[PDB]
Symmetry: C4
Subunit: 206 residues, 4 copies
């Protein structure tokens, strides 16, 4: 539970996201809850040139470490932590299927029972606002009130969970649900869904 271990895990999560096809280029950012704020990836540096010392600490007031530049999207990581006290890790990426659904501005409905992993019968899509702004942060905090993941219109995905391993797992599951949704929407609209009654049973079972 010390900084160098948590930074190591952040880096490993970045690399694994790229392995899984969820992150291309420099698009993702990952953070963990730490002391009074968080540890987050820096802006600009390619994932594969990332060393432990590159990880940035931002306190609870938004002041970041001396000599480092945090991800340009750090504000919605801090909004996630303040909106969901149980969240200890946040994964953000621009995964292609999730992002295509965000362009249509649709929520993902209950086309598969694994949608319950995010907390309910849907994956919401928060309205567009310029990256890095307060307005974006507010939409995100509202979307995560009762869901562990949300799409961001014309942008990508945010997933949060109790640790990095589970946050990555959820993010990967939402990209699969997005891919299922787009593949079936091309054939039929609307796509068959499971009823609220059936999702209620699955949620209890989880």
């Amino acid at each position: 539970m010390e900084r160098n271990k948590l930074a190591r895990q952040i880096i490993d999560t970045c690399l694994e996201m790229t392995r899984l096809g969820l992150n291309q280029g420099t698009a993702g950012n990952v953070s963990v809850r730490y002391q009074d704020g968080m540890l987050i990836t820096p802006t600009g540096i390619p994932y594969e040139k990332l060393t432990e010392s590159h990880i940035v600490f931002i306190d609870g007031n938004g002041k970041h470490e001396e000599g480092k530049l945090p991800s340009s999207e750090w504000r919605f990581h801090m909004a996630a932590y303040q909106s969901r006290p149980d969240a200890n890790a946040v994964v953000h990426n621009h995964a292609v299927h999730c992002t295509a659904v965000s362009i249509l501005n649709r929520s993902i409905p209950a086309i598969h029972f694994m949608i319950a992993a995010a907390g309910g019968n849907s994956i919401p899509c928060a309205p567009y606002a310029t990256f890095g702004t307060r307005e974006l942060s507010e939409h995100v905090a509202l979307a995560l009130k009762n869901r562990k993941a949300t799409l961001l219109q014309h942008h990508g995905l945010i997933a949060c969970e109790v640790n990095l391993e589970k946050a990555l797992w959820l993010a990967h599951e939402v990209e699969v649900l997005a891919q299922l949704y787009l593949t079936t929407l091309a054939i039929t609209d609307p796509v068959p869904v499971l009823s609220d009654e059936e999702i209620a049973v699955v949620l209890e079972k989880f």
Copy 2:
């Protein structure tokens, strides 16, 4: 034909499924026929942290080993074994193309002659029922009466065969047929099929 070899093979099949793109996250479960019951993967543990000792024995009465938690979908593995005496291995996964077809609730018709690998002129789609229930098990046992693989509505795929190698091979072939089906359904509906007469010739040749 001893437990440690069979457990080793189960684990290798899990890893290979992930290699092939058939399994994401923690979704699949694999089993083999053993003594009076079966050996199956455990619930929860990520595939890459799986060791031989993690594999769970469930007898013919449904009693599982002390100190282990079997896959939460073990009941339809036991239903497969009871419905098909010739089956010695069962692979279950949530492969994306198969699962998208299961959302449409369609059987895969004979769009390619390799559909005969599963025993007939189609890959059926068994109706939805909550995972882990007796109701689900019954649909699966009925769908496998005359087929070696079946889709499961809003869920995924089950394939069974004489050994793990062949069961994985079949599962991969059904995911390819599913992908062929979705790709052509987006262009034309209905999709051209081979006649029953032609499938009858291919079945004899196999």
Copy 3:
């Protein structure tokens, strides 16, 4: 130009086809022109368990080596060699995009100038006939009269060239053209094409 080198190359081509995503399971078969007949992969054996001694010699009369079982599709390899004297290697696979186009029973028209690599302004699609039959062989020999590659209705692809390296390269290029065709056909039908006059210029330049 001895047997063990050519067998080594066949095996390497099988492995590389799988690397490229052109071959799944046990579907492909590869051959090279040799002495009075050909060297071809065997039936059944998985690509990764293939050793030099597994490669099968079939003479010009169709008699195969003692103790080995040649690919079950060897007849259309022999038809390719007899129809195209310049062909020294044949690659056959069930690549997913090519096969989806073969299900629609469409030729691939000149949607990109690389279609000229196969010899003209199209990739034909030969009519369906049961695998391994004389009827299939005849369609293939007719389709390859003026083209180096052909789709096979409800089945897959055959590509031939002066050596294995070029035959694999062509097969991969046709799978890309197939993918381009399906992706654009989902959006608009018919798909824009280059005129015959423009393909004529590209053919001269190659």
Copy 4:
């Protein structure tokens, strides 16, 4: 800033392009600004057989080194350098999504805010002209006047930037935008876009 280092980087960029799924077969060509002309990949040689000595120097007059054959598409690399003085590296490939959009002859509109990486609110599509001709070069020089990347009708993509690392990164980002565009166009046409006012804010922020 010597030739052997720059050639090494060109080769590494070729290999990485193939790693990323942007380049299949022998289709791409990469160059860097050097002395009075450029260093470019040769024609024909497969990427994996490329050694430092294979890289070709072409001066500012179009004269290439003795004993080497430059890429057959070198003219539009030289046109890019003359049209954009700030460009120091050029990546060209036939990436499948970009190329499918080029077949439709559509520009990619602002469906995601990362479109601003190429300089504006769109990725243009330059009209078709035979590869290697002066006519093609002219369309490319006009398309790159106010954009760092362009699609080429019925052909592929060109991206330019201050160094190879950034040029590859841009090329990969445009392939993602192309994939986003095709995936959403199959569902709805036209696809929702961000307004010019919103792209103007994102451009300032970058």
